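Replying to the earlier thread about multi-chain prediction with a worked example.

Input:
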Amino acid sequence: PVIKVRENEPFDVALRRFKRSCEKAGVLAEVRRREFYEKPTTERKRAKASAVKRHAKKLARENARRTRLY
Amino acid sequence: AAERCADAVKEYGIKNLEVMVKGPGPGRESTIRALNAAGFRITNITDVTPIPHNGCRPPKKRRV
Amino acid sequence: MRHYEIVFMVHPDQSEQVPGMIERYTAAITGAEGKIHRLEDWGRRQLAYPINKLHKAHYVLMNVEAPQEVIDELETTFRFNDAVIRSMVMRTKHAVTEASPMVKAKDERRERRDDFANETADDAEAGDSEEEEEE
Amino acid sequence: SLSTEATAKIVSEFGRDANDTGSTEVQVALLTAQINHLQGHFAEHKKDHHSRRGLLRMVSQRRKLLDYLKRKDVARYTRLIERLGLRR
Amino acid sequence: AVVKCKPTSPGRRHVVKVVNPELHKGKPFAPLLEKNSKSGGRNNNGRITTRHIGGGHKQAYRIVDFKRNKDGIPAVVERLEYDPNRSANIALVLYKDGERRYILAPKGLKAGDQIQSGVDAAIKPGNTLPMRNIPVGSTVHNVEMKPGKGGQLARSAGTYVQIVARDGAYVTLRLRSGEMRKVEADCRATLGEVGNAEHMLRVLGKAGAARWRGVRPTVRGTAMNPVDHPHGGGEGRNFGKHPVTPWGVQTKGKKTRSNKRTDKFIVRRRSK
RNA sequence: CUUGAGUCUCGUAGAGGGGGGUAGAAUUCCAGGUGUAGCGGUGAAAUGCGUAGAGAUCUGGAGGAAUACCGGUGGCGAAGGCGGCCCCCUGGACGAAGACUGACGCUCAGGUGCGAAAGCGUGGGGAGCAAACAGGAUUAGAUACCCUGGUAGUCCACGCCGUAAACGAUGUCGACUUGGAGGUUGUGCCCUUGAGGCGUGGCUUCCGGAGCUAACGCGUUAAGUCGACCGCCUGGGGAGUAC
RNA sequence: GUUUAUUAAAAACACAGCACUGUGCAAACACGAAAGUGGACGUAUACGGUGUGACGCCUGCCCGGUGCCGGAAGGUUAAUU
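Result:
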């Protein structure tokens, strides 16, 4: 996961962020552990869970003003 | 390590280098900087890290 | 009927076996009041990673519509053809059998980017121009 | 799910001659035609429990509609059961 | 088919039998029976040299075509019969030109089918092909050991010699011994298994099955006396030497192979 | 009668079920090419494997579980439950108009049918991992803790009693009670300018009112208002065993 | 079932299955001066031989010593130049 995508102008330090778009994730991340078939369905699927923090954050900006912290 | 190997191969008579990379392990950049310090150009830092189509079950490791 | 997009590829040196089998298969399709809505040969092309040896194979895209019965004798036959390395047969839902996305790239391949060699004369004897031995 | 031209044979032979789909006889004959289609699958496939879920819907409703029909017109019942050749 | 006993008598407990409706329930046509007879283990000298062979039924013999050569001609598949002299079922094929053979059974047995030869025609079981023209992973029925020597590999019911490579000039196929060989592509084989595929749930179930198959019983070596077999014991049987046959070859050892004619084709063999 | 429910043709999404076909990469393995000394493991380590040339690396094939990411708040099933890709067989659900029958209804002891996973008999098969078992390491128990080898197993066809954390720990089906917005889909309308809006259904998910709760928490997918009928409980241990 | 003809008729022996292994078919193996033939004209779901002994549940450690199979890089090595 130095990533095959070539960094603009070649250098000895890979620009690993700017190279990667969806690599290592799922594919080379679960190293040396017993592989389950169906566990992801209940283990991993936390999209619903992260959607709550994004709403909450968009609510609180108006509310800090209404408290006059802002 | 990179420097150990790069010295000896001058007798095989090599002058320019490319690299294939295969792993999640440490030494990501610092092994490349040393290949560059043997006087070689290293324009191609090519990942070929093989992803099987979900291969053989790995060692369980800890009992949790 | 239900629409079955069969595409398959063939090893060059064993290819001489398939030109007799495809023309019995197209006849089993139109013989049942299904249709061949194109029958496109693409010529020989490079595989990225080898399948059943050699880094090249020869491609035929059928664009079938056919009844379910007929497709049951055919799938078992193309899959157990030695000349064929692999085949894939695609779903009825939202399925095209006309206006090929790869029609230009097929012509380009056939006309100009082919092998142009004797082992691939064996492939042009397996496309739309099929010739096969007398039994 | 059944062919237009078979569904039309069933409607012709069952219910009244008005050529409806809604009447007690023809709903029995249509339920059967799916049971018979299901029984083509269940000639093998004996462990196939998610489809079986459907078989107990279709049987139950054919029992319910014959039970209704002998409560309803007696001509329709006595004709239907013998015309659709069910049981032994 | 196979027919299995309900365990309704002593001696009938574990007993399995071979039956087909297609077997003639008359006696087979004796003008096509060319006499077996058995030799009770005895060679030219009048000695038993194959030991614990002897007894049982006469068990008559059919020539069997194990080469399957015919250009394009139909077979009605006139009957499927049990052969009491081998494990496989054997068909009487009666060709529509007036020729009768005995032929070893395929996975095919369709009436009015044709035993074909040549590339574009063969793709069903029993229809001949050079082995180059048969796909990888195929189970395959009855293989010629070398071209024109005849089908010496996979003859017993539902056994098979499954293709595991077929690239290059040769065919690689696996044998049920644990051996794996390359075999020249000019040999004949067919797709699908050998016939009578349900044979493999057979159990025998009585000492009498082996008796009519002409197999005589056989002692423990340790339960002979030291004089009658060298493995035989003293007081209280005394298994406690290394094991041997009655003629002195270490039975759980040795590699004796000296074929020196076909050794070029085996690229690995079974090992201890 | 329709106001319940049932049903026809029309349209739409998907890993629901069962059985078949089939490939390559990494581990593993063969063949060949090249090449020298450690490789491997973990908190850290030793046991393991290796000069008979390992490890690694290039080329092509092999074999068998598995099929990455795609796999999402997505979609399917009755609860458990569903994932390579495909075909063969087949369910149930979602929209929408025209029409049809007209309480044909609800619940349900017993009941037949039916498994997440492993158990399990015989046939076909078996690369890696692993209970057990060894040995290392730890803290005296691989069988507390941690690692390495390593066997039955895991895998398939069929066959035997369906267990649990069978669920938003919440039975069923149905009537009734302010909604907004997201994910995402049938579909009227719109720079379809906004996975958006409005029009109307769909699962799915955030949010909170009337009400309810010991408390968290629920709230139109109830843990609210109710309806009928079923399942099941009545202090703990000992007992999910006894009988 | 077989059994020391009669005083052991069994617990020994047998057998399916179960586990081990040789054998790829001009087989392994056997006897025979050797030609040869049996095995088998069958042939791996087949054949020779070993231990245990249908059937439900299984089968822990381990080669020190003793017997036997097997495998290789190579220093030399009989016979021999």
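Chains C and A do not touch (no CB pair under 8 Å).

Feel free to reuse this layout for your own posts.
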